[PDB]
Design a binder for this molecule. Structure first.
Ligand SMILES: [Mg+2]
Ligand SMILES: [Mg+2]
Ligand SMILES: [Mg+2]
Ligand SMILES: [Mg+2]
Ligand SMILES: [Mg+2]
Ligand SMILES: [Mg+2]
Ligand SMILES: [Mg+2]
Ligand SMILES: [Mg+2]
Ligand SMILES: [Mg+2]
Ligand SMILES: [Mg+2]
Ligand SMILES: [Mg+2]
Ligand SMILES: [Mg+2]
Ligand SMILES: [Mg+2]
Ligand SMILES: [Mg+2]
Ligand SMILES: [Mg+2]
Ligand SMILES: [Mg+2]
Ligand SMILES: [Mg+2]
Ligand SMILES: [Mg+2]
Ligand SMILES: [Mg+2]
Ligand SMILES: [Mg+2]
Ligand SMILES: [Mg+2]
Ligand SMILES: [Mg+2]
Ligand SMILES: [Mg+2]
Ligand SMILES: [Mg+2]
Ligand SMILES: [Mg+2]
Ligand SMILES: [Mg+2]
Ligand SMILES: [Mg+2]
Ligand SMILES: [Mg+2]
Ligand SMILES: [Mg+2]
Ligand SMILES: [Mg+2]
Ligand SMILES: [Mg+2]
Ligand SMILES: [Mg+2]
Ligand SMILES: [Mg+2]
Ligand SMILES: [Mg+2]
Ligand SMILES: [Mg+2]
Ligand SMILES: [Mg+2]
Ligand SMILES: [Mg+2]
Ligand SMILES: [Mg+2]
Ligand SMILES: [Mg+2]
Lengths: 168, 96, 107, 89, 53, 57
RNA sequence: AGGGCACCACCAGGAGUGGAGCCUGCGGCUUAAUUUGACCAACACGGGGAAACUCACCAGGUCCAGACACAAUAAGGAUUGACAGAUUGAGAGCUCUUUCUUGAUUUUGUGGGUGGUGGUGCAUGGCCGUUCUUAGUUGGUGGAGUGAUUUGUCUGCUUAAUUGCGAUAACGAACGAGACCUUAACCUACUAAAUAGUGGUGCUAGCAUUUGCUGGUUAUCCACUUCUUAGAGGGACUAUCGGUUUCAAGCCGAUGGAAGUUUGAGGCAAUAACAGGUCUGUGAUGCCCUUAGACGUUCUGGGCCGCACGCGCGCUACACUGACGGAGCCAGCGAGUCUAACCUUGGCCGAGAGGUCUUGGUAAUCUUGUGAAACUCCGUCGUGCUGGGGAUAGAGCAUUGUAAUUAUUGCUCUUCAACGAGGAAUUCCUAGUAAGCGCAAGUCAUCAGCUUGCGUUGAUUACGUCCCUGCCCUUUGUACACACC
């Protein structure tokens, strides 16, 4: 559409980032972890990887028609040129995003952090993971803040294996 | 202030007819895309509905997403005087 | 409709050279079994989009700089083909991640 | 009685070679001198927080057993509620 | 319909804002990101800019 | 601050009753919104005509 | 006290800086305001090159963009907007004069919200900087000890490295280092290409001539891949051979090789910290402050640039290893517009800056061989602050922009300052490196003396030490553990 390739691929990246923060803000109480966009001839499909597909798909297509209409109205798509599917994250314990959200919803329910963080660490480690680490930083009933870690197993910190085998 | 009745009606009937409204957080844009009124009128009419219930709002990168609740459909049907329980508007109307 | 060539060029632009050369290999194999005359997949110089930032969000510290890169790889395959049986198998198994454009020509 | 440019061109005590008579104050040859950081360690709020607030914020060392055991229990609960609800019920 | 409420904003720092956070300083304009540098460092991976060397 | 809005009826019109017919003067205009405008000092208050208004009273 | 390590230490040196003039940042002073944070690890830093905007500051003027709930007041009009005059910087009905328009959208109150580049970074998150990219950290089993703990993790040698060899009450491992990834260097070996070239000639065409230099048509050509591109691979492992070493780990020399400095350069980077920076990047945020005479928002103008002065990063020089003139003449990394005006060739006009008519390019296609500058050759000068230097200043012509004054910048003519190599001190640096030289990008309407990268030309000196400085380890002393603040 008379745009450069350098600007078209950058704009595709910005569209992906904007949908990522939009679904991160919207679908946070039903465990959205990721989004994948497939641009096809006269369709673009948006796959939402979530831990709970039933509260992404709503009932009778509510809350997926809402997101399809919201996304096509913001990004100015013609109707039926963008479609939204949902699929459930298999091996939920190996997802760092989902475990961060599960810890966040544990701590907003008023639950102690050495219970919550260890209950995430053991769940990840018997979900079939090589290693797990949880760091909690902030202030908890004291003004003076501290940070505290909860690590079990084996972790790599340096090199291309971090980009390969580590979710953060 | 004076949002006139015709402009509040054409905000609320777009919201019923499409189900959702997106607005850019751009006051002084003064013409919303797909609603025939000012962007700030759209923002503040949907704020007025949000504060009394009736729609849920989200913000996300300066773009103001509004979606109707179930109390929203039973208020806008009363307000805009649409046929009683025939019209969802628009979830779900045309795809089942 | 009876074995008439079109002189098409398919340009393939992506950021992921595995998926992109897989699509170009599939196109080359399709032409190589349909016996289409084709110029092979010409590989353009890969463009690097460099963005240099300071790492700090304020302006404190040693002046440390980050170079981010986006790498864009481009191929094109020319063909002389019958369009109505090319597009009977083009529109299926649609590739994700790779931007494809097919431009017809009469040159 | 005007003022402005008319007053500035006949303003006495104004100009470079009339400031050049007036010698420079010694405030001009200083520097900020360690910005109140020679007592950065000493918390000037004056709290030195009690043990009870820290212990009931981050957990104390007396109840590590009860922390770890129900952490194990709820991790097992998450394992069971994943494993029994994939292609069952 | 009021003619006093705006001044020209066709060029310069006040004409462009970050598309994420509406900031004016530090804006990255290369390739049409229109993102400030601080939001770009947060969003660079899910745009496709990576650190390689 | 703004006008106090005295409880007006139809005004700037004499009567229907007084001896013995209707008494309304100032024959009709091309202005549909007919009705008298404001008269301040040798002017009227043009509201419907977008550009052209050439009669002065 | 001992032992290590490192051009953010030194040695041997190079190039400086500190002196001069400008430029920019900081302090101070001044001011209506000169917004502010930061004091190795602040000070060309906040991507901070601010005319407006930015903007946070100053002098003024609007608007509500005060949701919602409740109570009053409304339909006998709650309220809204306005021509013209006064008013005002204002063509703000701001407010009056006046009389029109308007129609449970308000207004007035009380709660409650909302906004804030307002405070607190010593309430915080995230990110970043630093310790420190230094080599450091940890557990299993065994030994020691009542125990806290300790040994492993070490005398020596080695390495860039807690890298190994060895020694050995430890043995066998994990994080960090290394591996890894990216980039650079080689491939006449493969796969290829009118968006890269080359050779011919189906084709033709010139100029000197009798083949040298060229210009042009890829079903209105044929072929190839050396050069270029990018896929798949290969390649180096310190190979081989000497020497040296506890015949170890390794180190040095030579030969071969594209490569024998971890092959060059990065990215990533442990345990833990710091009252390090950032609340002014964020619709990150607790609390507090403010909220219609606003600290919200907008508009106009000013300021951030103000100048007795102190300091930091720089640019330009002090010339002949040069300046000027002409001529020669060569890169690489980028970037670019219709999802609206970007990069601009060519032609014409102008001394120039620039204008104009066209064109090509959404880009290996066109700008662009980015014909860059230093450099090279031939001349002019001739040791004189000189034809070195170009500060300061006058006049004029242009461009950007709504707007150039406090000169935006560019050009032309004139004016022609300090400065003759810089005390005390101090910085960076070990090979395609220092230094010199420009170019592109970033911010950008305009503005580069800045930064980020790129290439062009390309040395001297060492391949060390612990003397200085900083850091690390061990031993040691401790009445310290909030840990010498
Ligand atoms: Mg490792
Ligand atoms: Mg490494
Ligand atoms: Mg050491
Ligand atoms: Mg020296
Ligand atoms: Mg100097
Ligand atoms: Mg100042
Ligand atoms: Mg501060
Ligand atoms: Mg500066
Ligand atoms: Mg502002
Ligand atoms: Mg002030
Ligand atoms: Mg403000
Ligand atoms: Mg804020
Ligand atoms: Mg704090
Ligand atoms: Mg701090
Ligand atoms: Mg912090
Ligand atoms: Mg142990
Ligand atoms: Mg033991
Ligand atoms: Mg030990
Ligand atoms: Mg030791
Ligand atoms: Mg090292
Ligand atoms: Mg080749
Ligand atoms: Mg502090
Ligand atoms: Mg912050
Ligand atoms: Mg705060
Ligand atoms: Mg700032
Ligand atoms: Mg202003
Ligand atoms: Mg400044
Ligand atoms: Mg600096
Ligand atoms: Mg010359
Ligand atoms: Mg070139
Ligand atoms: Mg050209
Ligand atoms: Mg002279
Ligand atoms: Mg000026
Ligand atoms: Mg000025
Ligand atoms: Mg520039
Ligand atoms: Mg400027
Ligand atoms: Mg700068
Ligand atoms: Mg020493
Ligand atoms: Mg003690």
């Amino acid at each position: 559409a008379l745009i450069s390739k350098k600007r078209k691929l950058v704009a595709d990246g910005v569209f992906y980032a904007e949908l990522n923060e939009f679904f991160t803000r919207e679908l946070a109480e039903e465990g959205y972890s990721g989004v994948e966009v497939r641009v096809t001839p006269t369709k673009t499909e948006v796959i939402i990887r979530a831990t709970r597909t039933q509260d992404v798909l709503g009932e009778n297509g509510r809350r997926i028609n809402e997101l399809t209409l919201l996304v096509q109205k913001r990004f100015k798509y013609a109707p039926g040129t963008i479609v939204l599917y949902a699929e459930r994250v298999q091996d939920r314990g190996l997802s760092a995003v989902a475990q961060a959200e599960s810890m966040k919803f544990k701590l907003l329910n008023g639950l102690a952090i050495r219970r919550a963080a260890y209950g995430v660490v053991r769940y990840v480690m018997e979900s079939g993971a090589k290693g797990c680490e949880v760091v909690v930083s902030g202030k908890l009933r004291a003004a003076r803040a501290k940070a505290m870690k909860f690590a079990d197993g084996f972790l790599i910190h340096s090199g291309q294996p971090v980009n390969d085998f580590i979710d953060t | 202030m004076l949002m006139p009745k015709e402009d509040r009606n054409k905000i609320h009937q777009y919201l019923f007819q499409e189900g959702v409204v997106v607005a850019k957080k751009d006051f002084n844009q003064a013409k919303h895309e797909e609603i025939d009124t000012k962007n700030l009128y759209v923002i503040k009419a949907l704020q007025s509905l949000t504060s009394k219930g009736y729609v849920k709002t989200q913000f996300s990168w300066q773009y103001y997403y509004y979606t109707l609740t179930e109390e929203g459909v039973e208020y806008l049907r009363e307000y805009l005087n649409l046929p009683e329980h025939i019209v969802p508007g628009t979830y779900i109307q045309e795809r089942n | 409709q009876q074995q008439q060539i079109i002189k098409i060029r398919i340009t393939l632009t992506s950021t992921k050279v595995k998926q992109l050369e897989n699509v170009s290999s599939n196109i080359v194999k399709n032409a190589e079994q349909h016996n289409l005359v084709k110029k092979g997949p010409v590989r353009l110089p890969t463009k690097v989009l460099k963005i240099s930032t300071r790492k700090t969000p304020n302006g404190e510290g040693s002046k440390t700089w980050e170079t981010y890169e986006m790498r864009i790889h481009k191929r094109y395959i020319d063909l002389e083909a019958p369009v109505q049986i090319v597009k009977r198998i083009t529109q299926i198994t649609i590739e994700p991640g790779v931007d494809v454009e097919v431009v017809v020509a009469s040159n | 009685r005007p003022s402005g440019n008319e007053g500035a061109i006949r303003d006495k005590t104004a100009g470079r070679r009339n400031n050049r008579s007036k010698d420079v104050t010694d405030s001009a040859t200083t520097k900020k001198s360690n910005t109140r950081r020679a007592t950065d360690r000493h918390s000037r709020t004056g709290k030195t927080d009690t043990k009870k607030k820290v212990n009931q914020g981050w957990g104390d060392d007396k109840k590590e057993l009860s922390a770890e055991k129900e952490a194990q229990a709820d991790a097992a609960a998450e394992i069971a509620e994943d494993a029994a609800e994939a292609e069952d019920a | 319909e009021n003619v006093w409420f705006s001044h020209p904003r066709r060029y310069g720092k006040g004409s462009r804002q970050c598309r994420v956070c509406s900031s004016h300083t530090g804006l990255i304009r290369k390739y049409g990101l229109n993102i400030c540098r601080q939001c770009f460092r947060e969003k660079a991976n899910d745009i496709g800019f990576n650190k390689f060397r | 601050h703004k006008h106090k809005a005295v409880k007006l009826a139809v005004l700037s019109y004499y009567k229907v009753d007084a001896e013995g017919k209707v008494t309304k003067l100032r024959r009709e205009c091309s202005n549909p919104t007919g009705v008298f405008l404001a008269n301040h000092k040798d002017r009227l208050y043009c509201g419907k005509c977008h550009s052209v208004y050439k009669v002065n009273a």
